[PDB]
Amino acid sequence: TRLGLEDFESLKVIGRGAFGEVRLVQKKDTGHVYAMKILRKADMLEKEQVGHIRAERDILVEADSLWVVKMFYSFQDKLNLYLIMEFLPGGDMMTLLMKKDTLTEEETQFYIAETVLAIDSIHQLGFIHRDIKPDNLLLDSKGHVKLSDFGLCTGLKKAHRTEFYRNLNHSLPSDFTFQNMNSKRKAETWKRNRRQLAFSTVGTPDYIAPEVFMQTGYNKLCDWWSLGVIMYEMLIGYPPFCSETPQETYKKVMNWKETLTFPPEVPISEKAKDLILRFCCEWEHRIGAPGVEEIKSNSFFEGVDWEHIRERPAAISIEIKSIDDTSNFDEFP
Ligand SMILES: Nc1ncnc2c1ncn2[C@@H]1O[C@H](COP(=O)(O)OP(=O)(O)NP(=O)(O)O)[C@@H](O)[C@H]1O
Numbered sequence: 001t002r003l004g005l006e007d008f009e010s011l012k013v014i015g016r017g018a019f020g021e022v023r024l025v026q027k028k029d030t031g032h033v034y035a036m037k038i039l040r041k042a043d044m045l046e047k048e049q050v051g052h053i054r055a056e057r058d059i060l061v062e063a064d065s066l067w068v069v070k071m072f073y074s075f076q077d078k079l080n081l082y083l084i085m086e087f088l089p090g091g092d093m094m095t096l097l098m099k100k101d102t103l104t105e106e107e108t109q110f111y112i113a114e115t116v117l118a119i120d121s122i123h124q125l126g127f128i129h130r131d132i133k134p135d136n137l138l139l140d141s142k143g144h145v146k147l148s149d150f151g152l153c154t155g156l157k158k159a160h161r162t163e164f165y166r167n168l169n170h171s172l173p174s175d176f177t178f179q180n181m182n183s184k185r186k187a188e189t190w191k192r193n194r195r196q197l198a199f200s201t202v203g204t205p206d207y208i209a210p211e212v213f214m215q216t217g218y219n220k221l222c223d224w225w226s227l228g229v230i231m232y233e234m235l236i237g238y239p240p241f242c243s244e245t246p247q248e249t250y251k252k253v254m255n256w257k258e259t260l261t262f263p264p265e266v267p268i269s270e271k272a273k274d275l276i277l278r279f280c281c282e283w284e285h286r287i288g289a290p291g292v293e294e295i296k297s298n299s300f301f302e303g304v305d306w307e308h309i310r311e312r313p314a315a316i317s318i319e320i321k322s323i324d325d326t327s328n329f330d331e332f333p
């Protein structure tokens with residue numbers, strides 16, 4: 001009665017995470033195509049926590065947001081967790097940035113605006129996405145944004161945990177060589193190491209708001225900090241605080257007042273710079289604190305409708321030629 005692995009045929013691996021993989025699959029009796037996310041139980045939190053997260057996830061499924069990938073089934077065996085969801089053939093934003101290097105301000109405006117709406121919708125339903133970054137942003141067949149399935153793997157990467165930095169002081173970094181590289185060279189290093197970073201079970205705090213590592217605690221506004229980091233990366237080519245090691249990156253994040261700068265040779269608008277600085281400041285004055293409308297009325301979103309954006313042409317046309325077209329994903333061996 002309940003569906004299991006045998007009811008599906010794996011067609012191709014289309015994504016890899018630190019703690020599992022995502023496959024394109026075909027439901028045998030129907031021929032319909034789906035994405036199947038597989039997570040290894042041995043990498044997961046304890047069974048009780050996993051069960052409570054899956055239970056609360058069905059609230060999100062029930063709400064059926066435009067802005068979250070549609071999830072149809074979930075099952076498990078002794079090894080793995082499985083989630084069957086709609087296949088979104090536009091690929092993820094990390095891979096898109098890999099192919100384009102940077103986006104125009106108009107392209108950026110579009111993706112950020114849709115992501116503002118996506119993040120706000122999960123916040124309205126009581127969820128904090130504590131891992132906003134380009135590999136966790138998907139594009140559907142019309143090029144519009146959806147959040148991939150989230151919640152189970154939050155904070156599991158070693159470098160995403162406070163404990164990882166225990167005896168490391170918050171003093172300024174020391175990678176003076178790296179720091180004095182031109183922007184183009186920073187961008188190249190970031191790109192060269194990007195995929196490995198996504199698959200790493202260690203990772204970095206490049207996208208994590210500073211208060212997340214503070215004893216003081218944090219709130220839903222941490223997501224807006226992450227979005228700001230993504231916005232900077234879309235325009236400049238790498239997130240503001242990237243380094244050769246997660247330790248330096250952490251030091252750069254904690255010292256954002258000194259380390260968050262725009263390279264002199266890179267073209268970026270005054271509006272874009274201002275918004276990035278409103279996203280990436282201390283949470284008490286961070287844009288969005290009194291409500292999402294403060295974000296939406298930012299001068300950088302000047303042309304944005306915000307009622308009809310998801311119902312109008314997307315910034316970039318997804319070029320696919322079949323419903324099982326995997327050309328917007330990397331190959332996996
Ligand atoms: N529904 C989907 N349609 C198409 N590709 C997908 C889909 N879900 C995931 N992928 C691909 O697989 C990649 C990784 O899946 P992802 O959902 O991020 O799992 P994860 O990274 O292993 N765990 P998590 O920390 O929860 O994100 C994505 O960024 C895509 O490239």
Ligand SMILES: [Mg+2]
Nearest residue numbers: 017135136148
């Ligand atoms: Mg992921």
